[model samples]
Target: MKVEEILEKALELVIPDEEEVRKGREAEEELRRRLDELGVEYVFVGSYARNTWLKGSLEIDVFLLFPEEFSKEELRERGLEIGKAVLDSYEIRYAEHPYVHGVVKGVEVDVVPCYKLKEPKNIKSAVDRTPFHHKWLEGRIKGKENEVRLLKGFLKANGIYGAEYKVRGFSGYLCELLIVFYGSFLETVKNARRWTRRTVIDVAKGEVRKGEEFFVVDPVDEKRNVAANLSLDNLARFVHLCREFMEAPSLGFFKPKHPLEIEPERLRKIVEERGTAVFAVKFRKPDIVDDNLYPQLERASRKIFEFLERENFMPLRSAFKASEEFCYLLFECQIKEISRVFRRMGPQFEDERNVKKFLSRNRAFRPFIENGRWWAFEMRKFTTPEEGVRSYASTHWHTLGKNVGESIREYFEIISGEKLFKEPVTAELCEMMGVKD
Candidate 1:
């Protein structure tokens, strides 16, 4: 197809309607039939179920939520099993890093098996909250179909309501439904006017804009106003929705902060010893050693070499993979380390601000601002692509892309997993890193 026709077709696919719904239902029915055969229970999630906008693009999402009886380990195991089944039927490829996912009919669908939970807060909590989100959206938007549709479209296209490996649009159809229901939604919006007044006039070191007159662009001090101009109502609603969202039980922390909450001494030890890193996923065969591993090792090592050869792509790749499970290897290296390997890219590739930010925010970097120190950061994808999209980064990899750039996180987790003094490193590793014991 011509580029224009292709683009038009693509937009149509994204903006769903009756045809997409019919096809979506067909896929759900086929998938659900298979689930029933597997004795699995699932919930149809995302746009179709939530009354959000649907364009002719993308696949419908179905969360084959595992029952409450399953543990986190069991849930992941079962999720993979189900994912395999989907791949079998759809003839789609499996991607092993981040999580297991596949594409069906050109639309990418991820079958995440969530552990049943009692709330909806973060990924761990979304299991229980999915219903709440759907209800809220349904109620809030109700008759305002067009706006709800628009909002969902915006969220999906921008990947805003990202969750469950799929971009969830109009998260709580109820939230939008309520904007229609309470009329109070407008109150949430008026905060914008108040915000501009306070931020521009009250806090600026430069002459603040006085009264309600339009201000023209002019050179001024940069550090004076850096805070968000969000209004109270907007802030309140944002907080309210965020609070509700994190209360559900989920597979694990999706869109999680990395280096995963470590203690200080441990943090120091990790940086001093491993440099910077991430949890590199590996696999363990039941036999412990096998011919499969021969080829696998060769392949894995080759991929690793290619990855290190172009480590600049780490931000777009997962530090771990599923089929490559068993022994997820933790990688600890710094951007400086990576930059040397890719010197052809120059200074643009050598920046370390984002990676340092990750070190501050990662779990390993806990006490980020202890006596007051901060290691702020920032990637992933879930799926086992035994092959090429193998190099693909899920669009949902990082919240604010370019937030961090390094592999040190994996190494920290590896050493932390083996240490006796959990949390940071119990001052022991600190001494090793040259800190006073």
Candidate 2:
């Protein structure tokens, strides 16, 4: 489909109305005004500034730069002071710098500030550098606009594209550069003779460094041939997705793995065996697994694989294999809720009521609710705490009062500190002016 066509549909889902776009523009102006008054430079970045996608359902990002030369304490003090000033007297909230995100004028705005240092790319070095990089990417990738759009579409369809900085969001230029890399990156990998843990950049630049390729793409290619023959295309995709996840709370921390069942396998299995495994994934907090868990998990998984093989569930020539749970589940589940008019009755619980009845009767799953929202799991009958936390932490849901308060309490308790909410604050006290969710 044409870029406009796709954008129109996505816009309808994303920004939805002229009012939201207008408000987003207004938020940008307000942020700029506040930053100007404080002598902090600010620049618009991401989709809003790039003009790739419409304002519909998109958040505005502002890069607010702090003054040069200061300690972390002083920088943080200045950052919080500026942020508080921006949200002053208004029932608004603003996060801290290095990546200060908040809601301004009813529009989601990310206000990231930098504590000046050496290298411009070191987010701490120059607050506004990313904004400049973003603007540069916008201007440099003129001929590859559609290529960026194509990559976006491809990633979205394959379940990977993101528009946030937590993981690096690919600008049109980054997209273009990677595509160019795809065309010529093999030589770099081949030349990196000792490749046990080497960075692809060192390999690409012919620097004799570590063994093994760590990453194929670097942030500073300056050019716009995005897919220039990298070590692996998926590696590039993972890197881009990760950068975005780290930057934006609205975006999930997801790195797409290859689909569980290929299209042919999926179709053929469904047509013949009536079911096939599908793919889904989640990212856990770094500390969830210990050093021993990895080996134990691997050994248990291999044992399961052997059992499955003995049971004729796997073959040396077979495409399918049995496996143990590795925190992510990728299996097709029955859709329990569908509009009544679209129901396929008789031996199928396709409508909402029947689906609910089936679930209620199953009695195995608890309705997943974390922070007052449904945990969108197809297998509602298999609601697990790990699943709930994994999915909930992937979004803004974890930042809500219900989740945040508990986590805060957990930290305090662990540190042997007193509780902040031991005595519930009255409405008057609770009404302490702050940002609304």
lDDT by residue for model 1 (1-437), tens:
43233334344333466766767667666766777887877776655565454454445566766566766677667677777876543422332212356655445576766655444433353344554445445544555544444333433443343322222122333335324532332332233223333333322122344444322111122322222222333334443443432343121212222233346555645555654332233333223223333333334434553554354433222232223334232233333222111111112223467435444443422322322233322222222222112232222112111211011112112232344333222332333333332
For candidate 2, the 10 contiguous residues with the lowest summed lDDT are 412-421
- Candidates in order: C-alpha RMSD to true structure: 21.7, 20.6
Candidate 1 local Cα displacement, residue 288, angstroms: 29
Worst 10 residues of 1 by lDDT: 399-408
Runs in model 1 with CA error above 4 Å? Answer: 1-15, 54-57, 88-99, 118-128, 135-142, 153-437
Give the TM-score of each candidate. Answer: 0.36, 0.41
CA lDDT, candidate 2, residue 177 = 44
**What's model 1's lDDT at 394?**
23
lDDT of 2 by residue, 1-437 (tens): 43344444443332336676567678778777777887775567766676444323356766555556656566556655666777533333333334445677777765556543334444544344555556445665544443444445434543434423212333343444443443321222223233333443421353334435454443443232232333244445555543443344121221233333223333333323423222222122123223323333233324333433433332121111112322221122222122222211222333556446544533233444444333322333113322322333344222323422233223311100012122121111112212122
